[PDB]
Structure formats: C-alpha cells, structure tokens
Amino acid sequence: MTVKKLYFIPAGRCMLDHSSVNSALTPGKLLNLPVWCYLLETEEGPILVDTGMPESAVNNEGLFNGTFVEGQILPKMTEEDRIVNILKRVGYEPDDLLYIISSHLHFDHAGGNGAFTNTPIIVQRTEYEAALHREEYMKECILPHLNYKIIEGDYEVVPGVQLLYTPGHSPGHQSLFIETEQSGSVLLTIDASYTKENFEDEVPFAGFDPELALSSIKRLKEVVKKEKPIIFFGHDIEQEKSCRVFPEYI
Ligand SMILES: CCCCCCCCCC(=O)NCCCC(=O)O
Ligand SMILES: [Co+2]
Ligand SMILES: [Co+2]
C-alpha cells in the first residue's frame, strides 16, 4: 500500500547565517531559508510531518535576541504561517489528523505542536529526552501534556510511511522514507541534510554531533543505493526553486 498524496507545504521562512549550511564559511551573510511541513493523505487518514514555528515568532524576527544565537537565526513568520491557519486553508482542523510526526523538536519543526492536544505526536525518545534539558530547545517545543507517541529507532507509521532514525543534527532526529502512488520512493531527509551538498558532498552543517550526522548521511546513502528514491532536503534554497508545492503533490 502507498500514500495517496504527499504535499510540500511552505510554513514561513527563517534567516540563518550561511555558516549553518556550510560550517567552513565565514559568518556574515544571512540566507532566507524555507520552513516546510508535509501533509500525507493515506488510506488511514491524513498525517502531518512537522508543525512550523511557534506563536512567539509571528512578526518577531528578533525572537532570539538575548540568546546564544542572537543575530544568526531570525524567523520570518506571519500570522498566516501559524500551523492551524495553514491547516484550515488546506482543509483540516487539528483533531482531523491521524498522527503528527516530529522529525525533531527544533523550533521550526515543533513550534506548532501545542495546537495538537489529542493527536498522537510521534517523536524519537532520544529527541524528547534531549529537548527536556538542552539549551537549543524552546519551551513551546516540549510542552509536557501533549499526546506523545515516543518511539525508539526505525518505525513504520502506516504502510508506505517509514521513519528512519538519523541522529546527529539533533540527538533524536528522524527522516522519512515514503512510497507514494504517483512517484514511488521519496526520501525526505529533513534536517539530516539542510542542502544537497550536505548530503552528496558531505559538506558539514549545523548540528549537535556532526560525526553522528555524517554516519546518518552514510546510512541514508545505503538506503538510496538500494531504493533509488527522489530526495528532498530540509532547508535548500536551490532545490526549493524546482519543488512541486501545494496544491501540487507527488
Ligand atoms: C531557545 C533559544 C535557542 C532556540 C533556537 C536554537 C537554534 C539551534 C537549533 C535550531 O532550532 N535550528 C534551527 C535552524 C533550522 C533547523 O535546524 O531546524
Ligand atoms: Co533542525
Ligand atoms: Co530545520
């Protein structure tokens, strides 16, 4: 069984210093990068991958002033980019969703999690546990009483939707391997590679544990050699130019 539709849904944007996409570069040039969520229409119901940025980021580029990352991360988010507004425009309310999948709990992926208080939120145990104490996590991304479905390692969500454990960028980061009716095998790296060159050329990028991130890339390359998927990266300005986005699907 395959997924019926895989939608790429723009969920606002974020400025990052360009040393975050290539650790070699000298800081000083910001890049206006895409923030994504993905909607999977399946036999069993709709599944949302990631939930955009938090409320506090709306009309607030200076959100991280006063923090260790001041000036080097600036969210670009309007009221329209709140995940409940995105969902409503597409045609859903939060309680319609079968599952939320959190690739990881960075603020541009889990900022909207609080809107889903009934839907199971599938997240790696190592990511959940890290978010409870590491300083790069926002309180909006680790709310205590949501319906977490904590998993450990690779996991089949529904037929055609596989989670691949890809730690390194964050301690419990996970990627998606999807089989769609229209396109066959699709690999969503999410932040296991911001860009094509992080993946193909193993250019280092921002992460918790870059050595681990490299071994997760190598693991994904083994999957790619076996399955030959089309591959989409997490924060790639170049690839964004040719991506099919909502209302188009793959
Ligand atoms: C509470 C103050 C710190 C919160 C932000 C720390 C950012 C590092 C981790 C992070 O959120 N990176 C986002 C860039 C794209 C991504 O990697 O998701
Ligand atoms: Co991230
Ligand atoms: Co990200």
Side-chain angles (χ1 to χ4, degrees):
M1 184 52 55
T2 60
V3 167
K4 301 291 94 174
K5 301 181 180 185
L6 192 344
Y7 293 106
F8 288 59
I9 301 172
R13 306 187 68 87
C14 191
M15 315 293 309
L16 295 190
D17 185 84
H18 65 89
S19 61
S20 283
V21 310
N22 180 348
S23 306
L25 296 169
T26 304
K29 295 302 190 173
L30 275 28
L31 306 172
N32 190 333
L33 302 179
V35 174
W36 297 106
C37 65
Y38 312 84
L39 171 62
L40 300 161
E41 286 184 2
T42 67
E43 294 282 69
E44 299 71 30
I47 295 170
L48 176 65
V49 181
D50 290 344
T51 62
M53 286 169 288
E55 180 273 338
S56 54
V58 169
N59 299 321
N60 187 19
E61 287 157 10
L63 176 59
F64 300 122
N65 291 340
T67 75
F68 73 105
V69 64
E70 190 193 80
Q72 76 173 96
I73 305 190
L74 289 82
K76 303 287 279 191
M77 178 193 184
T78 66
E79 269 278 325
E80 299 181 343
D81 299 319
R82 296 170 75 126
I83 189 64
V84 176
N85 286 336
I86 299 175
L87 280 174
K88 196 50 178 180
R89 293 195 299 274
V90 159
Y92 291 114
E93 307 186 324
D95 293 340
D96 292 333
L97 279 300
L98 179 70
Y99 293 117
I100 312 306
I101 296 171
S102 294
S103 62
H104 58 312
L105 296 178
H106 285 173
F107 84 99
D108 53 315
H109 300 265
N113 277 12
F116 306 90
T117 62
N118 296 305
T119 307
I121 300 174
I122 302 171
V123 61
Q124 289 289 331
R125 175 169 312 286
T126 50
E127 183 73 13
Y128 183 85
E129 288 173 348
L132 293 177
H133 75 267
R134 288 189 58 95
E135 67 178 348
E136 70 268 24
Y137 290 91
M138 301 191 62
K139 296 305 269 298
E140 295 89 317
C141 298
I142 187 53
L143 292 165
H145 298 116
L146 305 183
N147 186 20
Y148 292 109
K149 185 169 184 159
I150 301 290
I151 60 164
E152 314 169 276
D154 286 3
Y155 187 79
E156 181 171 312
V157 176
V158 297
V161 180
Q162 300 288 344
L163 293 170
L164 297 171
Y165 188 53
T166 51
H169 167 71
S170 69
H173 183 277
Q174 58 188 351
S175 304
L176 292 92
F177 188 92
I178 304 165
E179 290 283 338
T180 80
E181 187 154 37
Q182 294 309 120
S183 306
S185 309
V186 176
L187 174 62
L188 307 179
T189 65
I190 321 292
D191 286 10
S193 280
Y194 282 176
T195 71
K196 184 173 170 186
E197 88 172 335
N198 301 146
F199 187 83
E200 311 268 333
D201 302 322
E202 299 170 5
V203 170
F205 65 103
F208 172 73
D209 184 339
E211 175 188 350
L212 217 209
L214 180 52
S215 60
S216 289
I217 287 167
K218 289 178 173 181
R219 182 189 185 217
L220 291 182
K221 283 180 172 177
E222 289 311 301
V223 178
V224 168
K225 288 183 225 296
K226 287 167 142 179
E227 304 287 351
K228 298 288 93 175
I230 59 185
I231 309 172
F232 296 87
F233 308 100
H235 294 293
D236 190 328
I237 308 191
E238 295 308 308
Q239 188 181 57
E240 177 184 20
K241 298 163 169 180
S242 61
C243 178
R244 304 272 173 220
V245 296
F246 187 93
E248 294 193 292
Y249 60 88
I250 73 183

Coordinates of all heavy atoms in Angstrom, one line a residue, residues 3 5-9 36-40 47-50 101-104 109 160-166 173-180 183-194 199 216 220 223-224 229-235 239 243-244 250:
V3 N 1.1 5.8 -0.1 CA 0.5 7.1 0.2 C -0.2 7.7 -1.0 O 0.4 7.6 -2.1 CB 1.5 8.0 0.8 CG1 1.1 9.5 0.9 CG2 2.0 7.5 2.2
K5 N -1.2 11.0 -1.6 CA -0.7 12.3 -1.9 C 0.3 12.7 -0.9 O 0.1 12.5 0.3 CB -1.8 13.4 -2.0 CG -2.9 13.1 -3.0 CD -3.9 14.2 -3.0 CE -5.0 13.9 -4.1 NZ -5.9 15.0 -4.2
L6 N 1.5 13.2 -1.4 CA 2.5 13.8 -0.5 C 2.5 15.3 -0.9 O 2.9 15.6 -2.0 CB 3.9 13.3 -0.8 CG 5.0 13.6 0.1 CD1 5.0 14.6 1.3 CD2 6.2 12.7 0.0
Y7 N 2.1 16.2 0.0 CA 2.1 17.6 -0.2 C 3.3 18.3 0.5 O 3.5 18.1 1.7 CB 0.9 18.3 0.3 CG -0.4 18.1 -0.4 CD1 -1.4 17.3 0.2 CD2 -0.8 18.7 -1.6 CE1 -2.6 17.0 -0.4 CE2 -2.0 18.4 -2.2 CZ -2.9 17.6 -1.6 OH -4.1 17.4 -2.1
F8 N 4.0 19.2 -0.2 CA 5.0 20.0 0.4 C 4.4 21.4 0.7 O 3.9 22.0 -0.2 CB 6.2 20.3 -0.5 CG 7.1 19.1 -0.7 CD1 6.7 17.9 -1.2 CD2 8.5 19.2 -0.5 CE1 7.5 16.8 -1.4 CE2 9.3 18.1 -0.7 CZ 8.8 16.9 -1.1
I9 N 4.3 21.8 2.0 CA 3.6 23.0 2.4 C 4.5 24.0 3.0 O 5.0 23.8 4.1 CB 2.4 22.6 3.3 CG1 1.5 21.6 2.6 CG2 1.7 23.9 3.7 CD1 0.4 21.1 3.5
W36 N 9.4 24.1 6.1 CA 8.4 23.1 5.5 C 7.6 22.4 6.5 O 8.1 22.0 7.6 CB 9.1 22.1 4.7 CG 9.9 22.5 3.5 CD1 11.3 22.6 3.5 CD2 9.4 23.0 2.3 NE1 11.7 23.1 2.2 CE2 10.6 23.3 1.5 CE3 8.2 23.1 1.7 CZ2 10.4 23.8 0.2 CZ3 8.0 23.6 0.4 CH2 9.2 23.9 -0.3
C37 N 6.3 22.1 6.2 CA 5.7 21.0 6.7 C 5.2 20.1 5.6 O 5.1 20.5 4.4 CB 4.5 21.3 7.6 SG 3.2 22.1 6.9
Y38 N 4.8 18.8 5.9 CA 4.4 17.9 4.8 C 3.1 17.3 5.2 O 2.9 16.9 6.4 CB 5.4 16.8 4.5 CG 6.8 17.4 4.3 CD1 7.6 17.6 5.4 CD2 7.4 17.6 3.1 CE1 8.9 18.0 5.3 CE2 8.6 18.0 2.9 CZ 9.4 18.2 4.0 OH 10.7 18.7 3.8
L39 N 2.2 17.2 4.3 CA 0.9 16.5 4.5 C 0.8 15.3 3.7 O 1.0 15.3 2.5 CB -0.3 17.5 4.2 CG -1.6 16.8 4.3 CD1 -2.0 16.3 5.7 CD2 -2.7 17.8 3.8
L40 N 0.5 14.1 4.4 CA 0.4 12.8 3.7 C -1.1 12.4 3.8 O -1.6 12.3 4.8 CB 1.3 11.8 4.4 CG 2.8 12.0 4.5 CD1 3.4 11.2 5.6 CD2 3.4 11.7 3.2
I47 N -1.8 12.6 7.7 CA -0.6 12.7 8.6 C 0.1 13.9 8.4 O 0.5 14.2 7.2 CB 0.3 11.4 8.5 CG1 -0.5 10.1 8.9 CG2 1.6 11.6 9.3 CD1 0.3 8.9 8.5
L48 N 0.5 14.7 9.4 CA 1.2 15.9 9.3 C 2.6 15.7 9.8 O 2.8 15.2 10.9 CB 0.5 17.1 10.1 CG 1.2 18.4 10.1 CD1 1.3 19.1 8.7 CD2 0.6 19.4 11.1
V49 N 3.6 16.0 8.9 CA 5.0 16.0 9.3 C 5.4 17.4 9.6 O 5.5 18.2 8.7 CB 5.9 15.4 8.2 CG1 7.4 15.4 8.7 CG2 5.4 14.1 7.7
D50 N 5.8 17.6 10.9 CA 6.2 18.9 11.5 C 5.1 20.0 11.4 O 4.1 19.9 10.7 CB 7.5 19.4 10.8 CG 8.7 18.4 11.2 OD1 8.6 17.7 12.2 OD2 9.7 18.5 10.5
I101 N 4.0 13.8 13.0 CA 5.3 13.2 13.0 C 6.3 14.4 13.3 O 6.3 15.3 12.5 CB 5.7 12.5 11.7 CG1 4.8 11.2 11.5 CG2 7.2 12.2 11.7 CD1 5.0 10.6 10.2
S102 N 7.0 14.4 14.4 CA 8.0 15.4 14.6 C 9.4 14.8 14.2 O 9.9 13.9 14.8 CB 8.1 15.8 16.1 OG 6.9 16.4 16.5
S103 N 9.9 15.4 13.1 CA 11.2 15.0 12.7 C 12.2 15.2 13.8 O 13.1 14.4 14.1 CB 11.7 15.8 11.4 OG 11.7 17.1 11.8
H104 N 12.1 16.3 14.5 CA 12.9 16.7 15.6 C 12.2 17.9 16.3 O 11.2 18.4 15.7 CB 14.4 17.0 15.3 CG 14.7 18.1 14.3 ND1 14.0 18.2 13.1 CD2 15.6 19.0 14.3 CE1 14.6 19.2 12.4 NE2 15.6 19.8 13.2
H109 N 10.3 23.1 13.5 CA 9.7 21.9 13.2 C 8.6 21.5 14.2 O 7.7 20.7 13.9 CB 10.8 20.8 13.2 CG 11.8 21.0 12.1 ND1 11.7 20.5 10.9 CD2 12.8 21.8 12.1 CE1 12.7 20.9 10.1 NE2 13.4 21.8 10.8
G160 N 3.6 2.4 3.7 CA 4.0 3.5 2.9 C 4.7 4.6 3.6 O 5.2 5.5 2.9
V161 N 4.7 4.7 4.9 CA 5.3 5.8 5.7 C 6.3 5.2 6.7 O 5.9 4.6 7.7 CB 4.3 6.6 6.4 CG1 4.9 7.7 7.2 CG2 3.3 7.1 5.4
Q162 N 7.6 5.3 6.4 CA 8.7 4.7 7.2 C 9.4 5.9 7.8 O 9.9 6.8 7.1 CB 9.6 3.8 6.4 CG 8.9 2.6 5.7 CD 8.6 1.6 6.7 OE1 9.0 1.5 7.9 NE2 7.7 0.7 6.3
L163 N 9.7 5.8 9.1 CA 10.6 6.7 9.8 C 12.0 6.0 9.9 O 12.1 4.9 10.3 CB 10.1 7.0 11.2 CG 8.8 7.9 11.2 CD1 8.2 8.0 12.5 CD2 9.3 9.2 10.7
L164 N 13.0 6.8 9.5 CA 14.4 6.3 9.6 C 15.2 7.2 10.6 O 15.2 8.4 10.5 CB 15.1 6.5 8.2 CG 14.5 5.7 7.1 CD1 15.1 6.1 5.7 CD2 14.7 4.2 7.4
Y165 N 15.7 6.5 11.6 CA 16.4 7.2 12.7 C 17.7 7.7 12.1 O 18.6 7.0 11.7 CB 16.7 6.1 13.8 CG 17.3 6.7 15.0 CD1 16.7 7.8 15.7 CD2 18.4 6.2 15.6 CE1 17.2 8.3 16.9 CE2 19.0 6.7 16.8 CZ 18.4 7.8 17.4 OH 18.9 8.3 18.6
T166 N 17.9 9.1 12.1 CA 19.0 9.8 11.5 C 19.6 10.8 12.5 O 19.6 12.0 12.2 CB 18.6 10.4 10.2 OG1 17.4 11.2 10.3 CG2 18.4 9.3 9.1
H173 N 17.0 13.0 15.8 CA 16.5 13.4 14.5 C 16.0 12.2 13.7 O 16.7 11.1 13.7 CB 17.5 14.2 13.7 CG 16.9 14.7 12.4 ND1 16.9 13.9 11.3 CD2 16.3 15.9 12.1 CE1 16.3 14.6 10.3 NE2 15.9 15.8 10.8
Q174 N 14.9 12.3 13.0 CA 14.5 11.2 12.1 C 14.0 11.8 10.8 O 13.4 12.8 10.7 CB 13.3 10.4 12.8 CG 12.0 11.2 13.1 CD 11.0 10.4 13.9 OE1 11.1 9.2 14.1 NE2 10.0 11.1 14.4
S175 N 14.3 11.0 9.8 CA 13.9 11.3 8.4 C 12.8 10.4 7.9 O 12.4 9.5 8.6 CB 15.2 11.0 7.5 OG 16.3 11.8 7.9
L176 N 12.2 10.6 6.8 CA 11.1 9.9 6.3 C 11.4 9.2 4.9 O 11.9 9.9 4.0 CB 9.9 10.8 6.1 CG 9.3 11.3 7.5 CD1 9.9 12.6 8.0 CD2 7.8 11.4 7.5
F177 N 11.0 8.0 4.8 CA 11.0 7.3 3.5 C 9.6 6.9 3.2 O 8.9 6.2 3.9 CB 11.9 6.0 3.6 CG 12.1 5.3 2.3 CD1 13.2 5.7 1.5 CD2 11.1 4.4 1.8 CE1 13.4 5.0 0.3 CE2 11.3 3.8 0.6 CZ 12.4 4.1 -0.2
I178 N 9.0 7.5 2.1 CA 7.6 7.5 1.8 C 7.5 6.8 0.4 O 8.2 7.1 -0.5 CB 7.0 8.9 1.7 CG1 7.2 9.6 3.1 CG2 5.5 8.8 1.3 CD1 7.0 11.0 3.1
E179 N 6.5 5.9 0.3 CA 6.1 5.4 -1.0 C 4.8 6.0 -1.5 O 3.8 5.8 -0.8 CB 6.0 3.8 -0.9 CG 7.3 3.1 -0.7 CD 8.1 3.0 -2.0 OE1 7.5 3.1 -3.1 OE2 9.3 2.8 -1.9
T180 N 4.8 6.8 -2.5 CA 3.6 7.5 -3.0 C 3.1 6.8 -4.3 O 3.9 6.3 -5.1 CB 3.8 9.0 -3.3 OG1 4.4 9.1 -4.6 CG2 4.6 9.7 -2.2
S183 N 4.6 8.8 -7.4 CA 6.1 8.9 -7.6 C 6.9 7.8 -7.1 O 8.1 7.8 -7.4 CB 6.6 10.2 -6.8 OG 5.8 11.4 -7.2
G184 N 6.4 6.8 -6.5 CA 7.2 5.8 -5.9 C 8.0 6.3 -4.7 O 7.4 7.0 -3.8
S185 N 9.2 5.9 -4.5 CA 10.0 6.1 -3.3 C 10.5 7.5 -3.2 O 11.1 8.1 -4.2 CB 11.2 5.1 -3.3 OG 10.8 3.8 -3.5
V186 N 10.2 8.1 -2.1 CA 10.6 9.5 -1.8 C 11.4 9.5 -0.4 O 10.9 8.9 0.5 CB 9.4 10.4 -1.7 CG1 9.7 11.8 -1.3 CG2 8.5 10.4 -3.0
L187 N 12.5 10.1 -0.4 CA 13.3 10.3 0.8 C 13.2 11.8 1.2 O 13.7 12.7 0.5 CB 14.7 9.9 0.7 CG 15.7 10.2 1.9 CD1 15.2 9.4 3.1 CD2 17.1 9.8 1.6
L188 N 12.6 12.1 2.4 CA 12.6 13.4 3.0 C 13.7 13.4 4.0 O 13.6 12.8 5.1 CB 11.3 13.8 3.6 CG 10.1 13.7 2.7 CD1 8.8 14.1 3.5 CD2 10.2 14.6 1.5
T189 N 14.9 14.0 3.7 CA 16.0 14.0 4.7 C 15.6 14.8 5.9 O 16.1 14.5 7.0 CB 17.3 14.5 4.1 OG1 17.1 15.9 3.8 CG2 17.7 13.8 2.9
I190 N 14.7 15.7 5.8 CA 14.5 16.8 6.8 C 15.9 17.3 7.1 O 16.7 17.6 6.2 CB 13.7 16.4 8.0 CG1 12.6 15.4 7.6 CG2 13.1 17.6 8.8 CD1 11.5 16.1 6.8
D191 N 16.3 17.5 8.4 CA 17.5 18.2 8.7 C 18.7 17.3 8.8 O 19.7 17.7 9.3 CB 17.3 19.1 9.9 CG 16.5 20.4 9.7 OD1 15.9 20.5 8.6 OD2 16.4 21.2 10.6
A192 N 18.5 16.0 8.4 CA 19.7 15.2 8.3 C 20.6 15.7 7.1 O 21.8 15.3 7.0 CB 19.3 13.7 8.1
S193 N 20.1 16.6 6.3 CA 20.9 17.4 5.4 C 20.1 18.6 5.0 O 19.0 18.5 4.5 CB 21.2 16.6 4.1 OG 22.3 15.7 4.3
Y194 N 20.6 19.8 5.4 CA 20.0 21.1 5.0 C 19.9 21.2 3.5 O 18.9 21.5 2.9 CB 20.7 22.2 5.6 CG 20.5 22.6 7.1 CD1 21.3 23.6 7.6 CD2 19.6 21.9 7.9 CE1 21.1 24.0 8.9 CE2 19.4 22.3 9.2 CZ 20.2 23.3 9.7 OH 20.1 23.8 11.0
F199 N 24.5 16.5 1.8 CA 24.2 15.1 1.5 C 25.2 14.5 0.6 O 26.0 13.6 0.9 CB 22.8 14.9 1.1 CG 22.3 13.4 1.0 CD1 21.9 12.8 2.1 CD2 22.3 12.8 -0.2 CE1 21.5 11.4 2.0 CE2 21.9 11.4 -0.3 CZ 21.5 10.8 0.8
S216 N 24.8 9.2 9.9 CA 23.4 9.1 9.4 C 23.3 9.3 7.9 O 22.4 8.7 7.3 CB 22.5 10.0 10.2 OG 22.4 9.5 11.6
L220 N 21.8 6.8 5.2 CA 20.8 7.2 4.1 C 21.3 6.9 2.7 O 20.6 6.5 1.9 CB 20.4 8.7 4.2 CG 19.6 9.0 5.5 CD1 19.3 10.5 5.4 CD2 18.3 8.2 5.5
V223 N 20.5 3.3 1.9 CA 19.1 3.3 1.5 C 18.9 3.7 0.1 O 18.2 3.2 -0.7 CB 18.2 4.1 2.5 CG1 16.8 4.0 2.1 CG2 18.4 3.5 3.9
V224 N 19.6 4.8 -0.2 CA 19.5 5.4 -1.6 C 20.0 4.5 -2.6 O 19.4 4.3 -3.7 CB 20.1 6.8 -1.6 CG1 20.3 7.3 -3.1 CG2 19.4 7.8 -0.8
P229 N 15.4 6.5 -4.5 CA 14.3 7.5 -4.3 C 14.6 8.8 -4.9 O 15.8 9.2 -5.3 CB 14.2 7.6 -2.8 CG 15.7 7.5 -2.4 CD 16.3 6.5 -3.3
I230 N 13.6 9.6 -5.1 CA 13.8 11.1 -5.2 C 14.0 11.7 -3.9 O 13.3 11.2 -2.9 CB 12.7 11.8 -6.1 CG1 11.3 11.6 -5.4 CG2 12.7 11.2 -7.5 CD1 10.2 12.1 -6.3
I231 N 14.9 12.6 -3.7 CA 15.4 13.0 -2.4 C 15.2 14.5 -2.3 O 15.5 15.3 -3.2 CB 16.9 12.7 -2.3 CG1 17.2 11.3 -2.6 CG2 17.3 13.0 -0.8 CD1 18.7 10.9 -2.7
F232 N 14.6 14.9 -1.1 CA 14.3 16.3 -0.8 C 15.0 16.7 0.5 O 14.9 16.0 1.5 CB 12.8 16.6 -0.7 CG 12.1 16.3 -2.0 CD1 11.7 15.1 -2.4 CD2 11.9 17.4 -2.9 CE1 11.0 14.8 -3.6 CE2 11.3 17.2 -4.1 CZ 10.9 15.9 -4.5
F233 N 15.7 17.8 0.5 CA 16.5 18.3 1.6 C 15.7 19.3 2.5 O 14.7 19.8 2.1 CB 17.8 18.8 1.1 CG 18.5 17.8 0.2 CD1 18.4 18.0 -1.2 CD2 19.1 16.7 0.7 CE1 19.0 17.0 -2.0 CE2 19.7 15.7 -0.1 CZ 19.6 15.9 -1.5
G234 N 16.3 19.5 3.7 CA 15.5 20.2 4.7 C 15.3 21.7 4.5 O 14.3 22.3 4.8
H235 N 16.4 22.4 4.1 CA 16.5 23.8 4.1 C 17.3 24.3 2.9 O 18.4 24.9 3.0 CB 17.0 24.4 5.4 CG 16.1 24.2 6.6 ND1 14.9 24.8 6.8 CD2 16.4 23.5 7.7 CE1 14.4 24.4 8.0 NE2 15.3 23.7 8.6
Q239 N 17.2 23.8 -4.3 CA 16.2 22.8 -4.6 C 14.8 23.4 -4.5 O 13.9 22.9 -5.2 CB 16.3 21.6 -3.7 CG 15.4 20.4 -4.1 CD 15.6 19.2 -3.2 OE1 15.4 19.4 -2.0 NE2 15.9 18.1 -3.8
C243 N 10.9 22.6 -6.6 CA 9.9 21.8 -5.8 C 8.5 22.0 -6.2 O 8.0 23.2 -6.2 CB 10.1 22.0 -4.3 SG 9.0 21.1 -3.3
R244 N 7.7 21.0 -6.6 CA 6.3 20.9 -6.5 C 5.7 21.2 -5.2 O 5.9 20.4 -4.2 CB 5.8 19.5 -6.8 CG 6.1 18.7 -8.1 CD 5.2 19.0 -9.2 NE 5.5 18.4 -10.5 CZ 5.3 19.0 -11.6 NH1 4.8 20.2 -11.6 NH2 5.7 18.5 -12.8
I250 N 3.1 15.0 -4.9 CA 3.9 14.0 -5.5 C 3.5 12.6 -5.0 O 2.6 12.6 -4.1 CB 5.4 14.2 -5.4 CG1 5.9 13.9 -3.9 CG2 5.8 15.7 -5.8 CD1 7.4 14.2 -3.8

